[PDB]
Design an enzyme around this catalytic site. Structure first.
Site, PDB file in Angstrom:
ATOM      1  CG  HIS A 155      -0.374   0.514   2.301  1.00  0.00           C
ATOM      2  ND1 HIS A 155      -0.073  -0.273   3.438  1.00  0.00           N
ATOM      3  CD2 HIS A 155      -0.216   1.631   2.930  1.00  0.00           C
ATOM      4  CE1 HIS A 155       0.678   0.445   4.477  1.00  0.00           C
ATOM      5  NE2 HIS A 155       0.217   1.544   4.020  1.00  0.00           N
ATOM      6  CG  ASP A 169       0.171  -3.608   3.075  1.00  0.00           C
ATOM      7  OD1 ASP A 169       0.558  -3.279   1.982  1.00  0.00           O
ATOM      8  OD2 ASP A 169      -0.206  -2.834   4.047  1.00  0.00           O
ATOM      9  CB  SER A 217       3.066   2.163   6.311  1.00  0.00           C
ATOM     10  OG  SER A 217       1.347   2.328   6.885  1.00  0.00           O
ATOM     11  N   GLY A 218       5.193  -0.231   6.186  1.00  0.00           N
ATOM     12  CA  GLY A 218       6.317  -0.757   5.225  1.00  0.00           C
ATOM     13  C   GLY A 218       7.482  -1.144   5.986  1.00  0.00           C
ATOM     14  N   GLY A 231       2.939   6.656   8.878  1.00  0.00           N
ATOM     15  CA  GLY A 231       4.358   6.951   8.824  1.00  0.00           C
ATOM     16  C   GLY A 231       5.351   5.657   8.838  1.00  0.00           C
TER      17      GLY A 231
END
Ligand code: C1R
Ligand code: C1R
Ligand code: C1R
Ligand code: C1R
Lengths: 243, 243, 243, 243
Positions: free
Chosen positions: B44, B91, B194-195, B192
């Site tokens: 995402h 994801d 994320s990933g 922030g």
């Protein structure tokens, strides 16, 4: 509503506005009157987390938002238990008013389509609401109710269009079967129109084919508006709303 | 990162920051170096829609964001073909750099976990990133890399929790099998992050258990943090990254 | 307007709303009709820099902003030649409409005060407008015209109040002689009411005592509202407006 | 700083940053070290209302803001008593550090110009700071101290320019005698630079000619930067700052 125009007072007598309590009763989603005591709308507008009934109100067909307010309390918020996110599906909900409204020529219910209705792609349908007039472009005061003619598009065509310029495998469904698709690069519903109605005229009769659900930007290329398909959920709706 | 503190500069040598071109190369997501030429992040963060690789750059381990930048260009963006939304799943994504990076004790790759590892509750795990320190609360400059030990909880437990205070029917899975959950009302990742990575020290070596994916707020009750489960996607990762 | 109520439809027939061209003809300042062809407002609303007249329109008495819009073009913007900032003074201006307006019991001019009039503290005066109802909170839709009675106070009393909690030397005049002050911590004008009128019913008729000009926050302790004193500029006004 | 460049690490040893307390000690104005224990800055940065010392801190020369922070408390805020607003004048204040600074070639006081210095129009001068790089355009991180060469300009010329495109009568002063001005349509100080120094090297010696005070848009045609002329207030400055 993107690419449309202000609606004449005699059209869309079933359009409703959902209000949330705060400094003032602000509009956050649309809906449609499908029965004297029931408003049909999108689940994501009132869920998936449970909300407080006291903070919700319904406003019937207003030519200009907030100007002639006559807020109606809600008695029950019924969200499809299948629902979690609009991308997953089952984006639909029912609102039960505390009292049945007094049907009139100016404001009355929209007709649900028969379980057999198909709504062929290309057919002229209309979507209405008080949502943004464009991406990040609020509807300017006095907030007129807008409308725009959008063409329905076959599910597979839209699902395909959504794969164009994306990483998702073509074999992976994006626009599901309980969804419906309409609009183009110049016409479409927008943030704020959510839960609003997509209506089409068949046998000289307006039938609600969809409920504004989700999408990727307003009127964006290869990303047509996704609506919750009404025929798909008639049975669930009829478990509550008298035929 | 909500809770926790600033990470020692000797910790998390695999932590990376993904930057997007604009007024300046701003941080928008985390990631981890898993191979001298590859970065693991959340799908995402770069999809489902295809973005311009030219507007993307990677920044290796930085004690303080933007201060010692040495941006690295990206040659390929590989997003799991099953991805569309973090709630649906898959994801996860891979970023191939244009050149291999030189590893040292300060900056090297993180070890992926064997397909058998489950990371049972009571397992010590940490999540790191440059994200908000609380809901709607940006990490103030100089923007230090933060870390926080989060308690791992069984998927089943987290699923039930997500259904509390929600209209979603209990038998409708929210926290999916390809996911992992960790965190509580004090410890959790935030917008922030994320990933970024969630790592657990197993038998003396750090393995990456998951990728910061989604949730319903930061450190909110009954809404634990949700991560993409790395073990679930090993086969896919190896179709691209050398073993 | 802070601490007031919606104004009766039959009150303040001279209230005017200034509009600036943009997404929509938005309201930025108030004003008053003092002649079928002239509007009195604050110079800071339209100066000190010359703006394009085409981008400016005037709206006569409206119960609710934007509802019954009938914008009127402006041919001349005349700003007192001594104005530069509200603090320094001479915050007054005149607007000549392109066409004379028809007056009626619901929309007509306000009476200016005799050069000798000195609205003594204890004068029943009212201020009106479509400005914020408090520091940082806009008048919610449908934006009704609001009024509020405010206590007038001797210039020297307000001036001393302004020196309280300030480094400004006691002998350096803050509230000047071409100014008037009114309001307290519960009743006052606010952002958006600038240019609007402050009127007092003197011996049977309404006379405009001042023009909403400036202050330090709305309804703040020791910082009563400051208005341009109309009597001070009577001569200037007659250099442009007939009798 | 508009139209400027990142300052070399050896230039501007006197530049200081003013910090206000909140989520972090945020920069809000610049200043200059004119004595081991005194900081020169604009009154409007710390007035006209009385502020709390506890909430203020000073940071000496920093290549990149917030990076190597070593916050110094302030012992006393001294604001020129003729000050109320920057347009009226006397926009100058003195900050007294709780401790004298241990100067070095990398961090040390600037020199005040003697009461006789003039700084003729077309003088090579520089303004520095961490303010916006353009109109409503923040200095992106890592926040480097910027510098720009601005050309000084005769007071009557700036005053003349400010009257172009404005309603203020030509004989009415806008740029007053205790003000000075420099800059053009490409170079100028901006929001965030306020209280910062305007220095010129005269005979191999940098003298602070002004303090960034006010203006009308960064590097706008006919609206050159207005600075508080230092020479004009030497007497006031020396009432506190020893020679
Ligand atoms: C509800 O307003 C949320 C998003 C609705 C989308 C906006 C773009 N067109 C399809 C519907
Ligand atoms: C990525 O930055 C989006 C937000 C991720 C959520 C934050 C709260 N905890 C779970 C992950
Ligand atoms: C015009 O709208 C600017 C602000 C005017 C102030 C508001 C507080 N009371 C005095 C006038
Ligand atoms: C302080 O930062 C307030 C604004 C300063 C102005 C900006 C435009 N150039 C002159 C100084």
């Amino acid at each position: 509503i993107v690419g449309g125009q202000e609606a004449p007072r005699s059209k869309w007598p079933w359009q409703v506005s959902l209000r949330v309590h705060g400094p003032y009763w602000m509009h956050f989603c649309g809906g449609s009157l499908i029965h004297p005591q029931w408003v049909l709308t999108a689940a994501h507008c009132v869920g998936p987390d449970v909300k407080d009934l006291a903070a919700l109100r319904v406003q019937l067909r207003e030519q200009h938002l907030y100007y002639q307010d006559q807020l109606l309390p809600v008695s029950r918020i019924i969200v499809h238990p299948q629902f979690y996110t609009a991308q997953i599906g089952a984006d639909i909900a029912l609102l039960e008013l505390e009292e049945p409204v007094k049907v009139s020529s100016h404001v009355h219910t929209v007709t649900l389509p028969p379980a057999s209705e198909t709504f062929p792609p290309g057919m002229p349908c209309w979507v209405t609401g008080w949502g943004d007039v464009d991406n990040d472009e609020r509807l300017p005061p006095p907030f007129p109710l807008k409308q725009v003619k959008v063409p329905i598009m076959e599910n597979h065509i839209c699902d395909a269009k959504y794969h164009l310029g994306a990483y998702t495998g073509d074999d992976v469904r994006i626009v599901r079967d309980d969804m419906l698709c309409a609009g183009n690069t110049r016409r479409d519903s927008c943030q704020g129109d959510s839960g609003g109605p997509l209506v089409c005229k068949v046998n000289g009769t307006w039938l609600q084919a969809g409920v504004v659900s989700w999408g990727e930007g307003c009127a964006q290329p290869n990303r047509p508006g996704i609506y919750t398909r009404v025929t798909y959920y008639l049975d669930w709706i009829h478990h509550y709303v008298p035929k």
